[PDB]
Amino acid sequence: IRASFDKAEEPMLGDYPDIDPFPAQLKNPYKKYDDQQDRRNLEEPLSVNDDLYDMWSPDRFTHFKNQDALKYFIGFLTIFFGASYVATYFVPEKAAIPREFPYEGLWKESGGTEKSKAFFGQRSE
Amino acid sequence: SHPVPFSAANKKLVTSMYRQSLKLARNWISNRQLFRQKAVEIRHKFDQNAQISNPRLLARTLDETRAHLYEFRHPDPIVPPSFPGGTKYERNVPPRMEKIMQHNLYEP
Amino acid sequence: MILAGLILKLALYAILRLLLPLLCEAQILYTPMIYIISLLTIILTSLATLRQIDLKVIIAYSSISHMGIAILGVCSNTSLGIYGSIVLGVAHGFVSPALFLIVGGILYDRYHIRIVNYYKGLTTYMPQLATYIIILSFANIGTPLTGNFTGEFLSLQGGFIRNPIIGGISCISVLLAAIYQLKLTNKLTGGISSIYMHRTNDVTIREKFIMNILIISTLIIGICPQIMYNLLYWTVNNYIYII
Amino acid sequence: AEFPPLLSQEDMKKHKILLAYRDRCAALLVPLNECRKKNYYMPWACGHERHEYEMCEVADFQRRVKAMDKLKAEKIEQAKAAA
Amino acid sequence: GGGRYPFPKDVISMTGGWWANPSNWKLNGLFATGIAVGLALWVSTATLPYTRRREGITSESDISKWNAAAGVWRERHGKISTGEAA
Amino acid sequence: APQLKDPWARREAWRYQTNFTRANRFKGAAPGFGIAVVAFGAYLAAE
Amino acid sequence: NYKWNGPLPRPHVSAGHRIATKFLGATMFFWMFLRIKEEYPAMLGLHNFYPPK
Amino acid sequence: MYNAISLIIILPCISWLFPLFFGRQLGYVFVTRMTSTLIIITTLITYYYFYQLLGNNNPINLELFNYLNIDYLDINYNFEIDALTITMLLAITTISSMVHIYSIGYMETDPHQVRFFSLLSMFTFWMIILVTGSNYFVLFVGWEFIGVTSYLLISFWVTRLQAM
Amino acid sequence: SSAHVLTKDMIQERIVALLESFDKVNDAKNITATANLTSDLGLDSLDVVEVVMAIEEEFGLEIPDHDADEIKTVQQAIDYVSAQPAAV
Amino acid sequence: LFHLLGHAFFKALLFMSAGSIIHSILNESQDIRTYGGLLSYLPYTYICITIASLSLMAMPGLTGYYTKDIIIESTYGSYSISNYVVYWIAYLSAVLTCVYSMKILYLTFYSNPNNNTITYYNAHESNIYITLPMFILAIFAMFAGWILKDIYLGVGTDFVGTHILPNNFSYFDTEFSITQFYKLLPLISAILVSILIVVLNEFFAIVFNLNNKYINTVYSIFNQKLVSDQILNHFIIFKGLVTSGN
């Protein structure tokens, strides 16, 4: 099947052949080719965008069409993070206050100077 | 079209469909007994329809099995490791024992 | 070799010698336009490299992105950026002629063709060449302990200091370099050896001599870049306009 | 009381206690960690000292639980006073 | 050996190649072990003077003096610590 | 009623015969359990 | 002596593999029993650190 | 004439480079055994350093030559083995040791064992470098080089397109 | 370790056992190298498929359609399985 | 840090075990749908892989317990109110590790044969260079966690001296606040789900082989890495190549 980027180059092919691209990954592996790894016979015409449809191109996935795949992917992410957000309203209350520290929140041991307590001071006591 | 019910083309087509269904059953089903059960059931479904005569109902049934095979595809099929979709396929290929072809009159 | 190594660096030297010492106020007003042009030159040229079919052409396109990073560095008004641009010039002048040797004097002298579709699996009969290709590729994309990384790092430091947004977006150079270089290296070194190519000799002592000189130099200036500072500790402060 | 004497800032610094452990119960952490250094931190060594520090911290935890007890009771008091 | 196939004998790699196991490898291994032990001894002995512990190298009186000098500098230049501008 | 017999059953029979029965497919599991039970009993007796 | 559809014989595993199997499993189960014996309250949640209410 | 840190750093580099220099001269037998032995010695040294650090916990440092000192940017080749580092090194050295001894039996009948063992030790060396550095630059050195080594090791079977 | 080699006699033994344990065969002592699957062994247009699948499973193979349909004699199957280096 | 150190040992053991399994098959196959009943054939590999899988399932005494249960507990002990949900997320991943290890163990060792017969005739344990590493790593994956516990997870250890903010230290609260339900549900869940998966696969295997289109589509998304390698390759890499050609 010719895609957008393939049939956009129709006004520019001129005398070059307009070839229907079919990726080599999906070609039949059990036939015998001159280049068995690349799945190509010698004088086989190459599409203008053969770089995209050769075996060194990125992998195709046949089981799910790509739009449905995006539906499932973004659906999983939305289910996860939406349930994560909803579950925050159903959280129990804590049973103990946070820890507290002796010398006015250790503002000196954390780098304070008696005006920097709000920045470096830890919890009250 | 003209899908003859008792020709060689129909033989190839239906044998291929039977192979595909049995391989899908092997791939989907982990247990051996259930796989054999499903294979026998598939053979029963094929033997029920081995007697069809009308090419229209035949073509409908063939389209139906195509849809069933597309519906029960497997994403990660079992392939032996040394065969094209396998883990070992092009692992250590013996190199072609070619001789050196020279390109310069002076450089080895 | 001469072009990519020296004539492209004449422009960097020309900036530093003709345009910064004179014209300081025009430069300090214009340099955001320089940053526009440099970021475009980086990203679009790298992506354009990703769809080329000729090897020497790929290396040629690769020169442009690194010179754009050097321009970010030299037009940064930061000492580290100037030093980085100069180290980039030197290290690219070492590494890019080595790649040009591989793709225009080793392979082109054996096969007289440069189309990528013919080349595959050089590792089997030509292993030393494959080692050289991998080394020079990972040097060209900016692996540490090569001067390419030092220069890229300091040029991008300067660009970030001057314009954090542009200088930060320009750090996808580190990725795109890897893409367009390793997509070629992986095919050349990888797979079964091509059916369109007969076997030929591996690299000779001469080719290896050249590549080894050019690798030793970049590894020296990547492991200790500081050895170039005794001729540049004035130059890194002579062209800085800060009151 | 259940808590040991609070260390002074100068001895906290002398023993180089991490600030997360510079609490009321740090006086029992010192011998534990010196014993650990002495016995190479193995688990069969410093049981008594570890138990002492752990029970001191359990006491602090019970105290904080009672603080949150008081806070919840106060908020319910304020609630039924607000209606 | 087992599982082996033909390979070109005129291919020369710095690594072995195909099942490299020359019939002098004990002598060459002796040489390589000698060079390795010597290089390791050289590196260790020569890098002894460049080693140090983290602690106990600088007296805390030096640290006190340096921090005090820092405070002197900071109030000479009229500077306040972080957070005090509130 | 929904019952049919396998024409490959004589080929598939060895997958449930000796060393593949429901017994033999679990005998080697927990190999040294009894030795451990005995040794731990001795240990607790040596308290 | 290959029965291509028949009941396959018992495997001829070596003695060192039979002895090392019963040594690791024995060590594993013994270690598990001992750690459970000396840490059942902590791993089961029997110590209650909360105050008496 | 004993440096835990320097032995730890240099012995894996030997195990990496000496096969690459001398593989056609040594063969896969000696290369396997030598790389194994060197990683084993590094592992024992790390265990002893871990013992000593639990005893004392004063980390050793190793301050070598200067990379870049231009304008306010002082980067040196400085290394250190602290608590976090020695833990990561326990993991690294132990698993590399066991993997080296494991791949003698696994990768027998492979024609390219020398390169395989060289690359395993390459990864070991650069991970030691990653963890021992006292600055982010040495970390990045190790980072990038372990990426390189991962590429080469995943690409070990170069004839397999999917591996590439 | 993996000290195992295949031979034509071994393939023949395994295939004749495979066919002997198939219930839809006519009966035994029709099974030889020269035997035909359709005529002599009396197999349908899908029991041949079941046999080819069983051969795949036995020798660890994958037999495409263009190589499956052209198996109509037992010797043909033996030839085919011996012409595959990964026949286990 | 502690879980990193333990994971190294028992995961390297798992992969070594898998390599020995892969080499026990004549055709070195990696699919668990083609292994079957290799228990009596590969007993040493079995005990090593189950040691590692139990020290990954967080069973008592082993390194997985000490290294992994404390994180699921610190999810609850964290001072932040919102981290309670992460308890349940981590819990489900735990009761899933039980699943995807017991699946391996059953399909590889306990199940009925699925390979041909010659595979089991030639199935054998591998040589000393493979087994000795597996032995040492099993010893590690049994003992090292209990050894290094008081170094890494102890009360006030000071060994790894990362300067945690005092407001953020939640370990003392984590070990004490945790009640019986939130302390025992991970372990009991593991010990139950393992038995259930084995029992279902052995007696009620139809539960996993229903042949439903709506179950199979979900299996297929989860079998294709949550269509994650199709989204990247199509919508990023391929569109990048197209924009690059443009």
Ligand SMILES: CCCCCCCCCCCCCCCCCC(=O)OC[C@H](COP(=O)(O)OCCN)OC(=O)CCCCCCCCCCCCCCCCC
């Ligand atoms: C479009 C303009 C983009 C400009 C900005 C740059 C964006 C990122 C770069 C994308 C550019 C396109 C790259 C195209 C290169 C493709 C080259 C190639 O042919 O290599 C293919 C290779 C995969 O080979 P594969 O088919 O998968 O085989 C698998 C079997 N082993 O493929 C690869 O190796 C892929 C390498 C690239 C990886 C990109 C990963 C991006 C994912 C982002 C996820 C989001 C994470 C959160 C980030 C937060 C940021 C704030």
Ligand SMILES: CCCCCCCCCCCC(=O)OC[C@H](COP(=O)(O)OCC[N+](C)(C)C)OC(=O)CCCCCCCCCCC
């Ligand atoms: C840091 C500065 C550089 C360090 C020195 C590196 C050069 C030493 C000589 C290596 C010889 C060699 O690797 O040979 C090259 C190998 C030969 O493979 P083979 O094992 O001999 O079998 C021969 C079987 N063929 C012929 C079928 C392949 O070809 C390759 O597979 C390509 C991978 C290159 C490995 C690169 C080595 C790691 C260096 C990476 C640093 C960035």
